[PDB]
From Swiss-Prot:
Keywords: Host cytoplasm, Hydrolase, Metal-binding, Metalloprotease, Plasmid, Protease, Repeat, Secreted, Signal, Toxin, Virulence, Zinc. Zn(2+) binds at residues 421, 425, 463, 470. Residues 122-285 are annotated as: IIB. Inhibited by NSC-12155 (1,3-Bis(2-methyl-4-aminoquinoline-6-yl)ure). Inhibited by phenoxyacetic acid bearing alpha-benzyl substituents on the C2-side chain. Inhibited by sulfonamide hydroxamate with benzylic additions at the sulfonamide nitrogen. Also inhibited by sulfonamide hydroxamates with alkylation at the sulfonamide nitrogen. Inhibited by hydroxamic acid inhibitors. The keyword Zinc applies. Induction: Positively transcriptionally regulated by AtxA, which, in turn, is induced by bicarbonate and high temperatures (37 degrees Celsius). Sequence repeats lie at residues 17-35, 44-59, 62-80, 82-99, 101-118. This is Lethal factor. The chain holds residues 299 to 809 of 809 of the full protein. Residues 287-511 are annotated as: IV. One of its GO terms (biological process) is proteolysis. Its EC number is 3.4.24.83. It comes from Bacillus anthracis. Residues 17-118 are annotated as: 5 X approximate repeats.
Length: 513
């Protein structure tokens, strides 16, 4: 009985629930229902020029904002635009679809600082974005301190374990949007023509490396399984351990303590009401047990690649910064990503550049927390307005490549292409450094490449138009694609770029040691 199960769990927590202070309850509600920014107040604080700018800006052309930030800005844009006449509005929509032109400098610098003013107060999101590393300097300090306060108080509210009677007598459930874990597989996991069906091949991709999971925020789970909504194709079924701490929430839910591990027991395609879903069976285990598995994998992948790249065995090159629900896939796909990397790029280029990165204590960081909360970025990027979220990043100050697993890259088939793009930036860096080690600049800042960008910059991908550095990186990525057609387009549509990049590669490989 669904209702008896509910009643029995509610009874187990009944004293706890009765004992909550009003401030205790408020905190639990805030956790569940985040506090949104006030659009009207945001808009009122803009100058007339800024309002204009915001009316006509192409938000999805941004390459530094998170999904959440982008979604809020679009809503903000609707309000600002809803006094304009219909033609204006129709034109503004018609122009956005038929062209993805890059943002102007004016547009970009405006969005970068506006970023500071559009953050919701969202405790569970803050924990997921930071993987529990809540002191990370990616938001206002005073807001940071409130989060820490709230989170410490929630931890202290959640002191009562599910206990040895209930733990093996109940399942709990969580419906999940697949994009939350993999935006990349998400785009295809549903059958293209029959969306009552799951793509069997993508399903295998999703399942094959899904062995463990981490929850860094507070899971809100259903006592009784709820029929899936629109965006929900993942249906978790979870077994707690006797010492898992939790609290009861109204309408038959538990909130679980943060920092738990999950071992994946089974992943199956199931049918509910003539539609296909993915059942995930998981068991709660100590997070420490999963962190041990991650650290062992980090040790192994470094040993393997230090040997392959001829680095000292102790070299710390590859880092797993892993804290969220698709953990094991971040870890395992790193192996595949670096395989493709070595497959598609000349061995001497890879060795020369990687040694340069190692020489500056650089890293390959594979992570499922957002890039502003990665130290290899934020320790050199103090200004939140200069902090970037995206699929990947190269940070010259730390000689580090960062790769964010859960998100999906603009016009990138997979994570391997995203890594190779970022490696393009490292090549750009090393090439420029070999020109002048003292005042070390990027080779894409040389006047020659600037001249080449002005001619061929619009001849490859839409994202390549953004600027010299991105153009070089895109050109570099396409020149080393598994697809011969893509290598050929560069040679044919951007022959000076093609030649310039091959020359730099020779210059790099031929520099003496
Ligand atoms: Zn880039």
């Amino acid at each position: 009985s669904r209702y008896e199960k509910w009643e029995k769990i509610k009874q187990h927590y009944q004293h706890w629930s009765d004992s909550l202070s009003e401030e205790g309850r408020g905190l639990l509600k805030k956790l569940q229902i985040p506090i949104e920014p006030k659009k009207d107040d945001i808009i009122h604080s803009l100058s007339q020029e800024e309002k204009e700018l915001l009316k006509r800006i192409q938000i999805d052309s941004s390459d530094f904002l998170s999904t959440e930030e982008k979604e809020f800005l679009k809503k903000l844009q609707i309000d600002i635009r809803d006094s304009l006449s219909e033609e204006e509005k129709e034109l503004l929509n018609r122009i956005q679809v038929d062209s993805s032109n890059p943002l102007s400098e004016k547009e970009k610098e405006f969005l970068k600082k506006l970023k500071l003013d559009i953050q919701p107060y969202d405790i569970n999101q803050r924990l997921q974005d930071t993987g529990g590393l809540i002191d990370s300097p990616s938001i206002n300090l005073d807001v940071r301190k409130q989060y820490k306060r709230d989170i410490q108080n929630i931890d202290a509210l959640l002191h009562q374990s599910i206990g040895s009677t209930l733990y093996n007598k109940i399942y709990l459930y969580e419906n999940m949007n697949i994009n939350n874990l993999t935006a990349t597989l998400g785009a295809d996991l549903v059958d293209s023509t029959d969306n009552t069906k799951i793509n069997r091949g993508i399903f295998n991709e999703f399942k094959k490396n899904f062995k463990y999971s981490i929850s860094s925020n507070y899971m809100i789970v259903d006592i009784n399984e709820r029929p899936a909504l629109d965006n929900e194709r993942l249906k978790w079924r979870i077994q707690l351990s006797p010492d898992t701490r939790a609290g009861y929430l109204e309408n038959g839910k538990l909130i679980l303590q943060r920092n738990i591990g999950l071992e994946i027991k089974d992943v199956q395609i199931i049918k509910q009401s003539e539609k296909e879903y993915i059942r995930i069976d998981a068991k709660v285990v100590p997070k420490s047990k999963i962190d041990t598995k991650i650290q062992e994998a980090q040790l192994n992948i470094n040993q393997e690649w230090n040997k392959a790249l001829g680095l000292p065995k102790y070299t710390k090159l590859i880092t797993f910064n892993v804290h969220n629900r698709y953990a094991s896939n971040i870890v395992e796909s790193a192996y595949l990503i670096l395989n493709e990397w070595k497959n598609n790029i000349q061995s001497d280029l890879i060795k020369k550049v990687t040694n340069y990165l190692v020489d500056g204590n650089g890293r390959f960081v594979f992570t499922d927390i957002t890039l502003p909360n990665i130290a290899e970025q934020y320790t050199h990027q103090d200004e939140i307005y200069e902090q970037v979220h995206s699929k990947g990043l190269y940070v010259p100050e730390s000689r580090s490549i960062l790769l964010h697993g859960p998100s999906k890259g603009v016009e990138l088939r997979n994570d391997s292409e995203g890594f190779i793009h970022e490696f393009g930036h490292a090549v750009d860096d090393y090439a420029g450094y070999l020109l002048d080690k003292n005042q070390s600049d990027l080779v894409t800042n040389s006047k020659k490449f600037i001249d080449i960008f002005k001619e061929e910059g619009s001849n490859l991908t839409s994202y390549g138009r953004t600027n010299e550095a991105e153009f070089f990186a895109e050109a570099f990525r396409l020149m080393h694609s598994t697809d011969h057609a893509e290598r050929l387009k560069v040679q044919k549509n951007a022959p000076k770029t093609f030649q310039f990049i091959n020359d730099q590669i020779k210059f790099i490989i031929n520099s003496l040691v």
